[PDB]
């Protein structure tokens, strides 16, 4: 990739960009006719949020998503990976891609609650005080609708609402 560094010596600021090692795609894709790296390796409908090995290749060092025109993914699969990365951080599966903390900030101790398949941000969810009748039940969303067409090895389809 490319790196940017600034060195200040003698009240003079110098900004330079140095090229570092760039990783290379593995040769001989199973499906060279594929348009995006997903179906080139026949990974469509075959990855989940816990597959951090696939997700780590499309994220920045601070956990941010990469642009679609850089990775080369299609719009359909970029959105799926976008949600899988969000659910990976919320499950604590990417501990090395934490947000950058500015100097002079020490995070306080907060209730550590284990979670997974978390569709929404925890801070932006209101409690379900009234479940409602059986025919009008207020369900709790689990997972993501963007992963509905994934490969299911059981006869029962994925239940996205509990």
């Amino acid at each position: 990739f490319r790196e940017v560094v600034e060195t200040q010596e003698g009240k003079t600021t110098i900004i330079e960009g140095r090229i570092t090692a760039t990783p290379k795609e593995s040769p001989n894709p199973p499906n060279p006719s594929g348009q995006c790296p997903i179906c080139r390796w026949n990974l469509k409908h075959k990855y989940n949020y816990d597959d951090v090995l696939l997700l780590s290749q499309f994220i920045r060092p601070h956990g941010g998503m990469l642009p679609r025109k850089i990775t080369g993914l299609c719009q359909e699969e970029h959105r799926k990976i976008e949600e899988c990365v969000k659910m990976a951080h919320r499950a604590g599966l990417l501990p090395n891609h934490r947000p950058r903390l500015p100097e002079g900030v020490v995070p306080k101790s907060k209730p550590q609650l284990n979670r997974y398949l978390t569709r929404w941000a925890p801070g932006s969810v209101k409690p379900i005080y009234k479940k409602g009748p059986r025919w009008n039940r207020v369900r709790m969303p689990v997972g993501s609708p963007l992963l509905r067409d994934n490969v299911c090895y059981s006869r029962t389809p994925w239940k996205l609402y509990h």
Binding site: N28, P29, P30, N31, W41, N42, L43, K46, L54
Partner: peptide
């Protein structure tokens, strides 16, 4: 060195 039906 990957078959046509290979999946990671």
């Amino acid at each position: 060195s990957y078959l046509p039906g290979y999946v990671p």
